[PDB]
């Protein structure tokens, strides 16, 4: 655990600033998230709790990764099916939509959340302020069915290029 702060602080900063987080910073946090997550999963350890409050960063920018029915709850897991790795891809999609447009995709009660899940709805990101490749990644990581979800080994090597061309 670091003593600088967390990611939710880093979103409340811009919420005070009334400015959207620029894309180089977005990818700069997202890649060191993804590499630590794939390092977790390659040694066969799941997380189950991918939450923006569970993201802890130094003041230099290094995400010192924290260790191992809520609102963040996948369509299969909110209908009490299997928490798969596709649930981790679901939570990475909701986390990225939070760091993209300053709030969650579905943000009370839990019926209408399941209803719009069955209707597969979410507000669209604006075009002019985020990369369209990121929105295509978003649409590929909030798919309802588990088999339509590419894993961390695809998205991390995607984001590696997205960051290396935005250093």
């Amino acid at each position: 655990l670091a003593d600088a702060g967390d990611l939710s602080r880093m979103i409340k900063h811009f919420k005070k600033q009334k400015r959207l987080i620029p894309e180089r910073t977005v990818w700069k946090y997202f890649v060191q998230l993804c590499s630590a997550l794939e390092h977790m999963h390659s040694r066969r350890v799941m997380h189950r709790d991918i939450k923006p409050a569970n993201v802890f960063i130094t003041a230099t920018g290094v995400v010192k990764l924290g260790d191992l029915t809520p609102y963040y709850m996948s369509p299969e897991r909110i209908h009490e099916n299997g928490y798969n790795f596709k649930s981790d891809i679901w939570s990475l999609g909701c986390l990225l939509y939070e760091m993209a447009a300053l709030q969650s995709p579905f943000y009370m009660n839990l019926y209408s959340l399941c209803k719009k899940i069955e209707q597969c709805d979410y507000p669209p990101l604006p075009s002019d302020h985020y990369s369209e490749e990121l929105r295509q990644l978003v649409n590929m990581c909030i798919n309802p069915d588990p088999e339509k979800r590419p894993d961390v080994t695809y998205v991390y090597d995607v984001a590696k290029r997205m960051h290396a061309c935005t250093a």
Binding site: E132, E133, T153, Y154, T166
Partner: protein, 798 residues
């Protein structure tokens, strides 16, 4: 045994291209993730554990496949290669490029049959076999190298489709390496095809290496001192000669003019002008040729429009104008047929073919190219750079350039698709046509360059490694844009000269790059002179230190334009703050907001910050938010507004310490000081004493206050009724939020009881992170809508 035979064959194959052994200069190889081709492919366990493949990438003509030929001839020379490998196979992706289903290919010139049933026995145990696939941008078909429907077996003796074999033996079960070289644009076809790759970008001709090129090309005193300096004295074309192909263009584009003498440095601007001048240097003394040029033009690009890259013993040209002019073009090109080595014909580097494709789409549906565009980019770039330059060279060179009315009908659709590809599309890695090169090579600078004054939409480009002549050429022409660039570290005046002249309408942010040590000390002279400049400014976690501060203290004093400045997370806390406050306090300033968060600051500076509110009536919203300061500044915080008429609207505050001292100081300012709207206290380790002093402070009648937040507390279950009764007594605030507060069921019970009659606040309320019971949650969701004076309540988790 078979090693040395075709080793000598590849020695003969790549020795003949031009030589090219005393004509090879080593280049730069970069992979940042934040080289040496000897053991480049290391799967070493630093961060590249299971890898078997790299991808080389640069722009059009950086020298990838000539580097591959140097590797082939180098290992074919030996050249200290400790034998990691045994047999290396050049696979030219513009000869294997068909779809018509041949099996494995290792016999090329149809020699005696190689031991192919032992050629895969020597893969399994010795993994010393490597296939340099080269030229991914022109693997023809229908731009279709997708996920394979069916795989092939790991012996490949069957005549499977190479669209379904090399894609598969690239994709799955390889146990053999491949180093594909490509433009990065066609990385996307290769991307979602899963590889686990490495990547290397290739960066070539610097100053001294270009000097070594001009020495190794010519004779050492004829023009190696004369042409070098005569091309050196140009404002561009030394920057443009980062690309080695432009160096090849000029060194064999005035070697023919050393006989005529002294025409060297002229009319040299772009990537377009070097190509058109070199083509004029070849095609000068025959203009007969007026039909030969159109015949060459009219058939050069159907080999990518219908996707047949090499011209197949020029039987296509045997249809269109096969005479001795074909041999003349072959002799003046010198690399058309001989590099194909049996019967086929080609262009030299096929950016010539994209160039003649630009000639084709001049002289032969350009929205078809528009829709097909991003799957490849060079044809669009070269046709644009051709276009306004030959509008210019309508009155320049002779009118052989167009034979026009087709020119305007592709410049107005060019800005039309530019409008279409900007206004609802930002693609950052692979879909180009939203880049400033396409206007750059265009410069007619009165409409077609300043039409992007309209279609700009508050953009921000990305200058990590481009030579900054291009964007400085671009946005200094137009007059809009709230731009946020990135990383102008080494070069200097490509920042200064354009951020000075932004006087029409501008804005800036350079956040989270690393401006250097005089990158702190740059932008002083950019901002220390009038006109119109930055209105508000952010520098988020940039490279900044103490030595900047006095410098920007001067831009504090000299500015009648600044209204909001941020120094976030850059360690500016001691002795530069003295410079900052004397620069701000020194002169009258029109500064209204200021931001100083998280900089490594302490209480040894706030005594200076007491003066700036009392003197300046313009500094109004000082977010000093939660940099590491604590106690003993607290009386200075009290003297910040002991007097009224401070003209301080908001005050963001800091994670503080002992509750009684800070809130006793805060009681005086929240009682006496008028026009104080907001107050963001947060992260403050407080108890009952601080909120008790707070409600005694707001007990002071006719003290005005808007929105207030108290976040971190474990409140007793009596203060809520006290504060809500004070708020029904007087509209002392408007809203409030609560965060990680373990305040229990009894507090919210008293809260909904006092909220049942005469809701105290009038804007908003927030209660988060609460695992309490639902019988009161029914009342919370109940009593918000019939009396919507309380509009929103935070519902914690359910």
């Amino acid at each position: 045994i078979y090693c040395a035979k075709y080793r000598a064959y590849v020695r003969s194959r790549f020795q003949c291209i031009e030589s090219l052994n005393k004509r090879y200069t080593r280049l730069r190889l970069i992979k940042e993730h934040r080289i040496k081709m000897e053991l480049l492919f290391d799967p070493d366990d630093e961060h590249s554990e299971p890898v078997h493949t790299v991808v080389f990438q640069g722009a059009a003509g950086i020298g990838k496949t000539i580097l591959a030929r140097k590797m082939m001839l180098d290992w074919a020379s030996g050249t200290l290669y400790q034998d990691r490998f045994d047999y290396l196979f050049y696979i030219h992706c513009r000869e294997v490029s068909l779809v018509t289903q041949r099996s494995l290919g290792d016999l090329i010139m149809s020699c005696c049959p190689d031991p192919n049933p032992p050629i895969h026995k020597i893969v399994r145990k010795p993994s010393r076999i490597l296939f340099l696939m080269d030229g991914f941008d022109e693997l023809q078909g229908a731009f279709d190298e997708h996920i394979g429907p069916l795989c092939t077996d790991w012996q490949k003796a069957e005549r499977g489709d190479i669209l379904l074999s090399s894609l598969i033996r690239k994709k799955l079960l390889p146990e053999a390496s491949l180093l594909i070289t490509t433009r990065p644009v066609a990385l996307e076809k290769l991307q979602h095809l899963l590889d686990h790759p490495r990547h290397v970008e290739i960066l070539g001709f610097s100053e001294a290496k270009r000097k070594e090129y001009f020495f190794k090309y010519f004779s050492d005193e004829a023009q190696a001192r004369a042409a070098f300096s005569l091309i050196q004295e140009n404002e561009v074309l030394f920057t443009m000669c980062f690309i080695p192909l432009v160096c090849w263009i000029v060194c064999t584009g005035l070697k023919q003019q050393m006989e005529s003498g002294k025409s060297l440095a002229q009319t040299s601007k772009t990537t377009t002008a070097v190509y058109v001048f070199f083509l004029s240097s070849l095609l000068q003394p025959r203009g007969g040729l007026c039909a030969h040029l159109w015949g060459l033009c009219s058939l050069a690009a159907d080999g990518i429009w219908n996707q047949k890259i090499l011209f197949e013993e020029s039987d296509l040209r045997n249809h269109g104008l096969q005479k001795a002019d074909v041999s003349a073009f072959l002799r003046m090109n010198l690399f058309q047929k001989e590099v194909d080595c049996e019967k086929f014909y080609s262009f030299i580097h096929m950016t010539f073919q994209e160039f003649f494709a630009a000639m084709y789409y001049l002289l032969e549906n350009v929205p078809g190219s528009r829709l097909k565009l991003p799957s490849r980019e060079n044809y669009g770039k070269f046709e644009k750079g051709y276009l306004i330059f030959v509008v210019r060279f309508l009155f320049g060179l002779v009118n052989q350039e167009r034979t026009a009315k087709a020119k305007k009908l592709q410049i107005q659709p060019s800005q039309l698709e530019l409008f279409y590809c900007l206004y609802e599309m930002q693609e950052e890695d692979f879909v180009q046509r939203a880049m400033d090169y396409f206007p750059k090579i265009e410069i007619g600078f009165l409409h077609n360059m300043p039409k992007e004054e309209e279609e700009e939409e508050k953009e921000g480009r990305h200058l990590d490694m481009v030579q900054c002549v291009l964007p400085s050429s671009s946005h200094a022409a137009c007059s809009h844009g709230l731009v946020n660039s990135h990383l102008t570290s080494s070069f200097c005046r490509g920042l200064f000269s354009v951020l000075s002249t932004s006087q029409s309408l501008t804005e800036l942010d350079l956040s989270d790059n690393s401006l250097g040590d005089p990158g702190m000390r740059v932008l002083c002279e950019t901002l220390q002179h009038p006109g119109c400049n930055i209105r508000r400014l952010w520098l988020g976690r940039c490279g900044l230190s103490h030595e900047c501060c006095f410098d920007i203290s001067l831009v504090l004093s000299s500015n009648q334009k600044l209204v909001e400045l941020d120094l976030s997370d850059n360690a500016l806390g001691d002795f530069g703050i003295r410079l900052l406050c004397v620069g701000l306090k020194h002169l009258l300033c029109n500064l209204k907001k200021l931001w100083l968060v998280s900089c490594c600051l302490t209480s040894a500076c706030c005594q200076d910050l007491a003066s700036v509110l009392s003197t300046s009536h313009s500094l109004t919203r000082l977010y000093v938010g939660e940099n590491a300061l604590g106690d003993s500044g607290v009386a200075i915080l009290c003297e910040k507004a002991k007097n009224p008429q401070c003209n301080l609207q908001k005050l963001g505050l800091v994670n503080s310490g002992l509750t009684s001292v800070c809130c006793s100081a805060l009681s005086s300012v929240l009682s006496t000081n008028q026009n104080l709207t907001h107050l963001y206290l947060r992260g403050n380790t407080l108890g009952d004493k601080g909120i008790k002093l707070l409600c005694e402070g707001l007990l002071h009648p006719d003290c005005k206050l808007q929105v207030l937040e108290l976040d971190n507390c474990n409140l007793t279950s009596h203060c809520c009724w006290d504060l809500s009764t004070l708020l029904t007594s007087s509209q002392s605030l408007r809203k409030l939020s609560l965060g990680n507060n373990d305040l229990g069921d009894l507090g919210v019970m008293m809260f909904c009881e006092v909220l049942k009659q005469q809701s105290c606040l009038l804007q908003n309320l927030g209660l988060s992170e609460m695992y309490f019971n639902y019988e009161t949650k029914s009342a919370l969701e109940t009593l918000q809508e019939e009396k919507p004076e309380l509009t929103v309540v935070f519902e914690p988790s359910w």
